[PDB]
mmCIF file with all atom_site columns, C-alpha atoms in Angstrom:
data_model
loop_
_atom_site.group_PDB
_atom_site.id
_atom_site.type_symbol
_atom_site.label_atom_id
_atom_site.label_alt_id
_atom_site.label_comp_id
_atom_site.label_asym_id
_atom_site.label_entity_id
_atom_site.label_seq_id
_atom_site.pdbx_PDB_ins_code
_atom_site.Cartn_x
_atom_site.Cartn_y
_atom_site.Cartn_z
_atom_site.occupancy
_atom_site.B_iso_or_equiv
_atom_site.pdbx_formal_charge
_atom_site.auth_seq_id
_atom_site.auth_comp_id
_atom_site.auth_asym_id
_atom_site.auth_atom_id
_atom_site.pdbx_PDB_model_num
ATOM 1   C CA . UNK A 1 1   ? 68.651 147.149 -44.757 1.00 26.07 ? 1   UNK A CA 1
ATOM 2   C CA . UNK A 1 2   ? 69.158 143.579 -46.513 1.00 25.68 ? 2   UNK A CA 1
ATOM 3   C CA . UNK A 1 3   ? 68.075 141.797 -49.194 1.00 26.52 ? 3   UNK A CA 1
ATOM 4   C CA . UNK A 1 4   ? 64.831 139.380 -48.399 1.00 27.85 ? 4   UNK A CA 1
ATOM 5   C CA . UNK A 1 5   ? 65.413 136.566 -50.509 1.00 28.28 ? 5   UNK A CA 1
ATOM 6   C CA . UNK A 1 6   ? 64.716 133.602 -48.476 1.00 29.27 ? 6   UNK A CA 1
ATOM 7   C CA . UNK A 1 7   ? 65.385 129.978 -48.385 1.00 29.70 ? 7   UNK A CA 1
ATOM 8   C CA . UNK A 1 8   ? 61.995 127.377 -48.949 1.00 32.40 ? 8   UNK A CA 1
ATOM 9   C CA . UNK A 1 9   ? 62.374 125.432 -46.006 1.00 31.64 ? 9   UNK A CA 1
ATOM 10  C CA . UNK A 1 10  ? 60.127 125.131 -43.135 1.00 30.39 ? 10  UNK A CA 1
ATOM 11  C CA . UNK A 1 11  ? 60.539 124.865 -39.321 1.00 29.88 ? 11  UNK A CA 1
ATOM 12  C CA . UNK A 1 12  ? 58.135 121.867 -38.218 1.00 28.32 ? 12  UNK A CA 1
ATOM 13  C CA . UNK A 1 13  ? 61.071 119.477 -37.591 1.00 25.73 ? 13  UNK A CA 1
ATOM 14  C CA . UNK A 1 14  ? 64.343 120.125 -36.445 1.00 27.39 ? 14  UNK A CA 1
ATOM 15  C CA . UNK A 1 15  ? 67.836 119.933 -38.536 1.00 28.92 ? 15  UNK A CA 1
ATOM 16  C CA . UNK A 1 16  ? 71.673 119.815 -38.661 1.00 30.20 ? 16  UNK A CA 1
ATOM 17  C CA . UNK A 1 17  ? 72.753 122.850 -40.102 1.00 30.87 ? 17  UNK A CA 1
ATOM 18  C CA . UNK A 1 18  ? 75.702 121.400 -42.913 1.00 30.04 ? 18  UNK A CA 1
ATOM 19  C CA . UNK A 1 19  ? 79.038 123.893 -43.374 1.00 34.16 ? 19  UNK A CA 1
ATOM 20  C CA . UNK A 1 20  ? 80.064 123.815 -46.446 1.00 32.97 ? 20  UNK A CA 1
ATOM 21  C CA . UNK A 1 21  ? 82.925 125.381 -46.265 1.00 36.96 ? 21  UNK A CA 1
ATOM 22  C CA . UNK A 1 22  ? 85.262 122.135 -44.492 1.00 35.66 ? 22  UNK A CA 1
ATOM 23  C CA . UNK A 1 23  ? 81.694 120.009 -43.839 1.00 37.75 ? 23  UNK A CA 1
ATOM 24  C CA . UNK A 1 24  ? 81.067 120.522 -39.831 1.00 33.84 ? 24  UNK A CA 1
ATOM 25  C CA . UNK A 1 25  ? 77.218 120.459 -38.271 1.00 33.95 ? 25  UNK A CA 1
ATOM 26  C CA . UNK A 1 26  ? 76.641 123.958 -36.097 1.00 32.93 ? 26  UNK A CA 1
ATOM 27  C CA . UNK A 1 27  ? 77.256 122.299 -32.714 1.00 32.52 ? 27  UNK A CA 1
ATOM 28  C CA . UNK A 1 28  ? 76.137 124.048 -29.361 1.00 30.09 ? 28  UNK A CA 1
ATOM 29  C CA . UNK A 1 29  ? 77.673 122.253 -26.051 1.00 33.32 ? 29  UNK A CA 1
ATOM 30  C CA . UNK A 1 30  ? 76.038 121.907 -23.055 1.00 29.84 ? 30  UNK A CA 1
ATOM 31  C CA . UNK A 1 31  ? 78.826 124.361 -21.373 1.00 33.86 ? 31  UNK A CA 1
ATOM 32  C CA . UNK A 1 32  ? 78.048 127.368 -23.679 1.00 33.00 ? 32  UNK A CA 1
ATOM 33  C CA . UNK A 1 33  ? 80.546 126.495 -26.102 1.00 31.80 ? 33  UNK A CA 1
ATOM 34  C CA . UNK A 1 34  ? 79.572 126.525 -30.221 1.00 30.93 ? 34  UNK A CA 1
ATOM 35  C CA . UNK A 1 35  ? 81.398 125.269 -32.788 1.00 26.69 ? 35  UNK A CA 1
ATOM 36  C CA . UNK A 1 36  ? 81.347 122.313 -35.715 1.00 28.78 ? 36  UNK A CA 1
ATOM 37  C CA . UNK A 1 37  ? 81.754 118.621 -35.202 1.00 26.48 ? 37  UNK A CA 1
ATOM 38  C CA . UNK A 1 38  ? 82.171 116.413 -38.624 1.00 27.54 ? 38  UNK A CA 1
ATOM 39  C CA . UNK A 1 39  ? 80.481 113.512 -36.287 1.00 27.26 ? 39  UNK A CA 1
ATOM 40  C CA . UNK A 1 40  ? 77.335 112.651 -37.087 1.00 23.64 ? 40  UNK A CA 1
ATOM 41  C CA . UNK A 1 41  ? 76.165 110.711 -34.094 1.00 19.96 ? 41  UNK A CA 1
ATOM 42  C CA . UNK A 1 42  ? 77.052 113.934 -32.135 1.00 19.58 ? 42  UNK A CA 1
ATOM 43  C CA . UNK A 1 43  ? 73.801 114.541 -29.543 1.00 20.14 ? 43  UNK A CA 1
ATOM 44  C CA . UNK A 1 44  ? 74.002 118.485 -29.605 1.00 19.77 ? 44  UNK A CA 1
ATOM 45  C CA . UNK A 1 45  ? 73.999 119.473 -33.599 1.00 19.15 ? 45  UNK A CA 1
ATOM 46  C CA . UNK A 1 46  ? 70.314 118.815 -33.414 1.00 20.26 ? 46  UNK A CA 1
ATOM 47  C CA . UNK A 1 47  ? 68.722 122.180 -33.311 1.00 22.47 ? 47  UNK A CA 1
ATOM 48  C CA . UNK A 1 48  ? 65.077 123.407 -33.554 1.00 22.55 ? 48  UNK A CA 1
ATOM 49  C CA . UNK A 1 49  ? 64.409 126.570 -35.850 1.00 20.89 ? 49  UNK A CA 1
ATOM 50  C CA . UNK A 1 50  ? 62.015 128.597 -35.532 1.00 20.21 ? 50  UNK A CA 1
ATOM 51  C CA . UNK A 1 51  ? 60.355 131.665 -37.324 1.00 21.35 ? 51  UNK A CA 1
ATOM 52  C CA . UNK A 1 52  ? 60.010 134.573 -35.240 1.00 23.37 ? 52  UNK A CA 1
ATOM 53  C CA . UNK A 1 53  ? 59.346 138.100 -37.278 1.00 22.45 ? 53  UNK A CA 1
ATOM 54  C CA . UNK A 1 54  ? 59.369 137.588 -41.137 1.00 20.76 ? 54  UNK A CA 1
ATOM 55  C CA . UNK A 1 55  ? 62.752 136.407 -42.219 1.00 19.54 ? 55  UNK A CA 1
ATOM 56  C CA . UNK A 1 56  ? 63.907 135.896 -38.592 1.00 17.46 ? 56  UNK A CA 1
ATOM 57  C CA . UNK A 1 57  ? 64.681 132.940 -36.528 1.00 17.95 ? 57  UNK A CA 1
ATOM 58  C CA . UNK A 1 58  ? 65.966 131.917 -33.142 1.00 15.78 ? 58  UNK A CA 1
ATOM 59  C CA . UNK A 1 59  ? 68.302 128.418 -33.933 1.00 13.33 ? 59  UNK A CA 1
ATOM 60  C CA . UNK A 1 60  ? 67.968 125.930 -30.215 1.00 12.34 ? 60  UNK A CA 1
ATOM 61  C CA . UNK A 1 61  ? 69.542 122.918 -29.324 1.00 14.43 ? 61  UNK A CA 1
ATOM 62  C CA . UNK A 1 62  ? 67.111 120.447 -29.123 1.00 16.90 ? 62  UNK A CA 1
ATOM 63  C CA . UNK A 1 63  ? 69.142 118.649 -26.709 1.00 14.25 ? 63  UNK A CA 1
ATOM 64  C CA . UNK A 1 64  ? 70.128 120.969 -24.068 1.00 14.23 ? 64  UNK A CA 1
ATOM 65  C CA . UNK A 1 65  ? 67.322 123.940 -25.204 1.00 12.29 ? 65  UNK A CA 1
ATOM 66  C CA . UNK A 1 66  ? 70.285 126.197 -25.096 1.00 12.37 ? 66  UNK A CA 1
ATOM 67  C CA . UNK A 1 67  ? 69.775 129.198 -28.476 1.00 14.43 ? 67  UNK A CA 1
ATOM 68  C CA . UNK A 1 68  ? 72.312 130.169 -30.530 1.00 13.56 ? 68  UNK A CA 1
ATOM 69  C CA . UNK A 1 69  ? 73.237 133.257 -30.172 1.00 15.76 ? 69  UNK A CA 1
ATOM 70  C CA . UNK A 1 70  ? 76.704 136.062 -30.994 1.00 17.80 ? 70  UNK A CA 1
ATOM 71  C CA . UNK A 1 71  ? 77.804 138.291 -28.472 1.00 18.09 ? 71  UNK A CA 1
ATOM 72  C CA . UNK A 1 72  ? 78.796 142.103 -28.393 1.00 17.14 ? 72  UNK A CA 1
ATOM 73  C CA . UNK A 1 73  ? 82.595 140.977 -29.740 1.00 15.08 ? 73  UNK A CA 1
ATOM 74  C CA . UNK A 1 74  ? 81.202 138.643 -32.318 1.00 17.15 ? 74  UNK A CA 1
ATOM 75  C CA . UNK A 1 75  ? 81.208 135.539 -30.768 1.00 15.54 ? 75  UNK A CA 1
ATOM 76  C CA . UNK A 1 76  ? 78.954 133.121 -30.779 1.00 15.71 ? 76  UNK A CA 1
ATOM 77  C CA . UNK A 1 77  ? 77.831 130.863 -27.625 1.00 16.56 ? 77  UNK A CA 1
ATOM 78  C CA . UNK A 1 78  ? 75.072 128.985 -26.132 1.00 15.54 ? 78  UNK A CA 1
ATOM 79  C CA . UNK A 1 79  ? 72.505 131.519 -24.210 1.00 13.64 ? 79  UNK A CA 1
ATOM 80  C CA . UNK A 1 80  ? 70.394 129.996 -21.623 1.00 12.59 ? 80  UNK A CA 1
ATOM 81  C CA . UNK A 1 81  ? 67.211 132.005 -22.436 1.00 11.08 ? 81  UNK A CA 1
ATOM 82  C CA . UNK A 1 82  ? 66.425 134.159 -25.627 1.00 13.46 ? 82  UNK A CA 1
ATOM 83  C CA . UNK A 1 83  ? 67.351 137.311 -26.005 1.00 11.21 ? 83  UNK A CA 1
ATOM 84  C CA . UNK A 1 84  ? 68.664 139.787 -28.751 1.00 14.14 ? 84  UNK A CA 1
ATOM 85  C CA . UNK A 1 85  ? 71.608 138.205 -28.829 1.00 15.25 ? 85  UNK A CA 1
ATOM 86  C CA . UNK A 1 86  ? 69.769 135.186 -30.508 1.00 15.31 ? 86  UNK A CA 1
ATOM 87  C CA . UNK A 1 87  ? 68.045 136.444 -33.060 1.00 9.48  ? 87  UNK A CA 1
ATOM 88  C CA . UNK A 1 88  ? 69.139 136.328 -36.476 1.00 9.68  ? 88  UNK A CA 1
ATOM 89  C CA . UNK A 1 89  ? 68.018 136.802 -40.200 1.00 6.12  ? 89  UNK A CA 1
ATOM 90  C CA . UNK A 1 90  ? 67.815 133.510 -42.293 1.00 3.76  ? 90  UNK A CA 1
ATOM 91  C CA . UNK A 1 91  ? 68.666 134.135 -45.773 1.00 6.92  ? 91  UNK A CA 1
ATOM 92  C CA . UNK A 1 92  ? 69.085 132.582 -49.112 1.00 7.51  ? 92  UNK A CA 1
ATOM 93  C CA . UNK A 1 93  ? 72.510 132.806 -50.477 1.00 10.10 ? 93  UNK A CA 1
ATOM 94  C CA . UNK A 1 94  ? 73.653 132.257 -54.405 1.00 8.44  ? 94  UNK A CA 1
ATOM 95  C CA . UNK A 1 95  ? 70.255 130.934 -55.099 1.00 8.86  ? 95  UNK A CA 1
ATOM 96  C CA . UNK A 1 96  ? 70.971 127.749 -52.850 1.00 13.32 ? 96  UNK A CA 1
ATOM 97  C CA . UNK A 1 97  ? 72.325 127.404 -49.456 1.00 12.50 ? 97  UNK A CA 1
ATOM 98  C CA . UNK A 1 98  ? 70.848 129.218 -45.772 1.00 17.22 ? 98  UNK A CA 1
ATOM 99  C CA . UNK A 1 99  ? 73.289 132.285 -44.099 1.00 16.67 ? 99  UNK A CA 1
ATOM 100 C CA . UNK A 1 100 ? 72.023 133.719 -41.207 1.00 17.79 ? 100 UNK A CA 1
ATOM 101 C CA . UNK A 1 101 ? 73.253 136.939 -39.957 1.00 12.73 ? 101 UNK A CA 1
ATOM 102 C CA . UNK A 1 102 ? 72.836 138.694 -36.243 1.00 9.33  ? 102 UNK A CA 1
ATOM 103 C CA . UNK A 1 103 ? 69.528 140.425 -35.984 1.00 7.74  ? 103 UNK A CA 1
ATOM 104 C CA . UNK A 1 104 ? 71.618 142.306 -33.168 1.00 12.31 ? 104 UNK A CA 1
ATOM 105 C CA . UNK A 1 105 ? 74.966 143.163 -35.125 1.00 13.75 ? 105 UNK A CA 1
ATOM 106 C CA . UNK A 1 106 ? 73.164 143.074 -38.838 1.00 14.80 ? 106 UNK A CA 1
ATOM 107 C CA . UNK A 1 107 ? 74.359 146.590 -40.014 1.00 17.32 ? 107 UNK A CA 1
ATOM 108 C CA . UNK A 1 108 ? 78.050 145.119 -39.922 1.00 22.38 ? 108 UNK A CA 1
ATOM 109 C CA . UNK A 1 109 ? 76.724 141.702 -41.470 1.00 23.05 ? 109 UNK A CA 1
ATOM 110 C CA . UNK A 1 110 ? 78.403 139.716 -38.615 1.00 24.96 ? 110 UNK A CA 1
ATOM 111 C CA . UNK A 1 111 ? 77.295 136.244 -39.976 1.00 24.54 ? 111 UNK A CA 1
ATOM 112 C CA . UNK A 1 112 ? 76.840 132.732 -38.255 1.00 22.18 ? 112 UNK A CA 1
ATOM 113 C CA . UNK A 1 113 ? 80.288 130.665 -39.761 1.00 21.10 ? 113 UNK A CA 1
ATOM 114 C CA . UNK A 1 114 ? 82.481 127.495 -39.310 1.00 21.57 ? 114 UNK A CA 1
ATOM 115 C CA . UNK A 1 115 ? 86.247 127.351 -40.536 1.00 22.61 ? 115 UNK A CA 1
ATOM 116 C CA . UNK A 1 116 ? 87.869 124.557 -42.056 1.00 25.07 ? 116 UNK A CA 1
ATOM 117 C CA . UNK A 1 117 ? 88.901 123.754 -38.956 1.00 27.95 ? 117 UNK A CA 1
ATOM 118 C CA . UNK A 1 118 ? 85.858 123.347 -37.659 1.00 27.16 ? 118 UNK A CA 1
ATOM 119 C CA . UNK A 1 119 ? 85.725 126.718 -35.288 1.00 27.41 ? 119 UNK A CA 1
ATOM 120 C CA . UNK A 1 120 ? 83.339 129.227 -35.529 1.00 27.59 ? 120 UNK A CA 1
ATOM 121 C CA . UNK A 1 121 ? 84.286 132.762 -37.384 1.00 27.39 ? 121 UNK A CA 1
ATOM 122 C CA . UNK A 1 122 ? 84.266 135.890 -34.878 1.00 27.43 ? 122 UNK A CA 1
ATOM 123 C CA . UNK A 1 123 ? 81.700 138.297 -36.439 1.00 30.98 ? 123 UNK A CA 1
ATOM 124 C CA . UNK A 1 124 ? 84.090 140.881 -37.807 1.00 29.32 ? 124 UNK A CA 1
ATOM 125 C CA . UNK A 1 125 ? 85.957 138.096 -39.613 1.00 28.23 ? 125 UNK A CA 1
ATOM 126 C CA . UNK A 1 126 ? 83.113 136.811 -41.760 1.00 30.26 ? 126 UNK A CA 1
ATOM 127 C CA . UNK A 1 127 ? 81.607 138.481 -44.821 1.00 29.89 ? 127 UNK A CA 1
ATOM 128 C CA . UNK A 1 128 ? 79.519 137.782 -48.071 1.00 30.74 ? 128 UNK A CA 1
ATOM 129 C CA . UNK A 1 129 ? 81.444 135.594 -50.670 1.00 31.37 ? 129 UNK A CA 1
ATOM 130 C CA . UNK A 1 130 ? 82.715 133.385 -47.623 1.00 34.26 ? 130 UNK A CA 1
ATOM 131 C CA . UNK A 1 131 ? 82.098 129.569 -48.112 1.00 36.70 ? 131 UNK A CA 1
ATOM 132 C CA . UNK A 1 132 ? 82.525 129.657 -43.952 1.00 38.48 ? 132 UNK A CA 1
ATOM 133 C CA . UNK A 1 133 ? 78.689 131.842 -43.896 1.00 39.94 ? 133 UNK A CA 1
ATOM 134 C CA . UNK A 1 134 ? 76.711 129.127 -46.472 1.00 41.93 ? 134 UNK A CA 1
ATOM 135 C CA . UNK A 1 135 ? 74.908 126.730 -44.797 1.00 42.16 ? 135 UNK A CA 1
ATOM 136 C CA . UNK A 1 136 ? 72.534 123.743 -45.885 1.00 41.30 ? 136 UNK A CA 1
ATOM 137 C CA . UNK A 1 137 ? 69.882 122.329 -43.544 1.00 42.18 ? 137 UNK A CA 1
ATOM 138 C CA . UNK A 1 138 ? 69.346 118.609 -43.443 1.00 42.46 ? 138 UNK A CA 1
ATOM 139 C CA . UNK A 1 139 ? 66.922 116.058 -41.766 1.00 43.12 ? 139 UNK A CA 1
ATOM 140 C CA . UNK A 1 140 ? 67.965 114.639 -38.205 1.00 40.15 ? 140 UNK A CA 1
ATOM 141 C CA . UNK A 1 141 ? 68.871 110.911 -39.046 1.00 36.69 ? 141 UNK A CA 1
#
């Protein structure tokens, strides 16, 4: 029920996924708690990708081994073990950058986003054409 363009990369080593929208990494703390960090020395933006079904991924901190995932009001937090919850399609977006939207939540494209401020977007609030949804994976220094 979406489009299956996706992005060339790979998932043998792990990245920093890059917001463009006010430049934070994804960051998942050790207490549960996601958001972005512009800091990149931080020790929990590191996180592992890795392809589950085709087009799907589960996104873990390679640090604490916590997953990514968004919760039944949109939120997104740190889960402990995988689950539903963490599962989420990786897409290519304006021929270029990486979106990834909740496996769980997909028919109301709830998307994976970072404000300016450097918080993470409820689900409900994002939506295609945001620059808070694009993302760009880099190498770990």
């Amino acid at each position: 029920h979406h489009h299956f363009n996706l992005p060339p990369g790979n998932y043998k080593k792990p990245k920093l996924l890059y917001c463009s929208n006010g430049g934070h990494f994804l960051r998942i703390l050790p207490d549960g708690t996601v958001d972005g960090t512009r800091d990149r020395s931080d020790q929990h933006i590191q996180l592992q990708l890795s392809a589950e079904g085709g087009g799907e991924v589960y996104i873990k901190s390679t640090e604490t081994g916590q997953y990514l995932a968004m919760d039944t009001d949109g939120l997104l937090y740190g889960s402990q073990t995988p689950n539903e919850e963490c599962l989420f399609l990786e897409r290519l977006e304006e021929n270029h950058y990486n979106t990834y939207i909740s496996k769980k939540h997909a028919e109301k494209n709830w998307f994976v986003g970072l404000k300016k401020n450097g918080s993470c977007k409820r689900g409900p609030r994002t939506h295609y054409g945001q620059k808070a949804i694009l993302f760009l994976p880099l190498p770990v220094s």
